[PDB]
């Protein structure tokens, strides 16, 4: 069969808090038609803003990725979206009650359990791709962010954090997503942030619903949290995940390889910007035989 469009099968519903907000959240993740794309609309306006979960929609990328429409904003949208793209959804409303995705357990782990558990369904439209075709990238600094050509989807990421609890360790991950490995690999590395930072960070509206319960806690020459890591390199798996929700504001799956170095959102939608505008290094394509394609995807 060709590969086809995935939306929702039901309605999908979650309660949180907002990360950098604390603000108290409901969401709601709902079918939608073919070619809609992830469009998160806030409910608790009247009439509602939609915006769609992409590129030309990025606003502010200060520790978060935000979409932006008019006056309002939808915050902290990459770890849902990860888990949208790791699980091939290309079209779903997600509604939330306030201007933040809530956090969860800092990770894309319950999003996944969450939509699993309603399932998915597969629509009557080829799925699309974006296959890259030549190397496009953006460096700041020492800071880098590359898309090579690659038939599958492949993600390696290298931090270097200046901090005993850091150096000495691999910080250095790749991870092959051309078969169904997301959901084991890096879907419940959790976000992570240092104790030090708390204070300014509060005072910028960041991080005021951030605790051991949501995150990763660093302190000066420890982890605050007591019961331990879910991966030994947990902290560049989460990087993995935000890329992949920051790639998903393409709009499309991706067919190539991402790499990242000391990158972050910031970097991440300037490379999907310089990429749009490269339409050279890319081209759209769709499998009318799964069997063929460079990717494979779970049943629905
Ligand atoms: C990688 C990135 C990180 C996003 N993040 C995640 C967590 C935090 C954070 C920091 C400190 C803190 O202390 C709480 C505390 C507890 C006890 C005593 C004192 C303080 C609690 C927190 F939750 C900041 C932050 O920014 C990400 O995952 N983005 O999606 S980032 C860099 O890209 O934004
Ligand atoms: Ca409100
Ligand atoms: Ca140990
Ligand atoms: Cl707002
Ligand atoms: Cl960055
Ligand atoms: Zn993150």
Redesign the pocket.
């Known amino acids: 069969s060709m590969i086809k469009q995935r939306t929702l099968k039901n309605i999908i519903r979650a309660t949180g808090v907002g990360?950098?907000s604390g603000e108290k959240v409901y969401l709601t993740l709902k079918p939608a038609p073919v070619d809609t794309g992830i469009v998160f609309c806030r409910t608790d306006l009247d009439p509602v803003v939609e915006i769609p979960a992409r590129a030309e929609n990025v606003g502010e990328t200060t520790?978060?990725?935000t979409l932006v429409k008019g006056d309002v904003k939808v915050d902290?949208v990459?770890?849902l979206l990860s888990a949208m793209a790791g699980l091939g959804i290309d079209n779903a409303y997600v509604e939330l009650s306030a201007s933040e995705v809530p956090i969860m357990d800092?990770s894309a782990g319950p999003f996944v359990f969450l939509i699993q558990s309603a399932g998915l369904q597969e629509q009557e439209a080829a799925k699309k791709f974006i296959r890259i075709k030549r190397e496009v990238s953006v460096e700041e600094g020492d800071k880098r962010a590359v898309f090579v050509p690659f038939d599958g989807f492949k993600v390696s990421f290298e931090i270097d954090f200046d901090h005993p609890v850091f150096r000495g360790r691999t910080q250095q991950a790749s991870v092959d997503f051309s078969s169904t490995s997301f959901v084991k690999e890096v879907s419940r590395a959790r976000?992570?942030?240092?104790?030090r930072?708390?204070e300014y960070?509060r005072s910028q509206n960041?991080?005021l619903?951030?605790?051991?319960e949501?995150?990763?806690?660093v302190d000066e020459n420890r982890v605050?949290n007591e019961d331990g890591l879910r991966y030994e390199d947990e902290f560049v798996k989460?990087?993995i995940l935000?890329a992949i929700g920051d790639l998903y504001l393409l709009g499309n799956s991706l067919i190539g390889e991402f790499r990242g170095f000391k990158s972050?959102?910031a970097l991440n939608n300037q490379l999907l910007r310089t990429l749009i505008a490269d339409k050279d290094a890319w081209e759209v394509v769709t499998f009318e035989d799964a069997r063929t394609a460079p990717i494979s995807y779970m049943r629905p």
Not at 209 to 212: I, P, Q, Y
Not at 214 to 217: D, E, G, L, T, Y
């Open positions: 990360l950098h520790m978060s990725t902290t990459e770890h800092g976000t992570f942030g240092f104790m930072d708390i960070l960041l991080a619903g951030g605790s051991v949501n995150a990763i806690v605050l989460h990087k935000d972050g959102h």
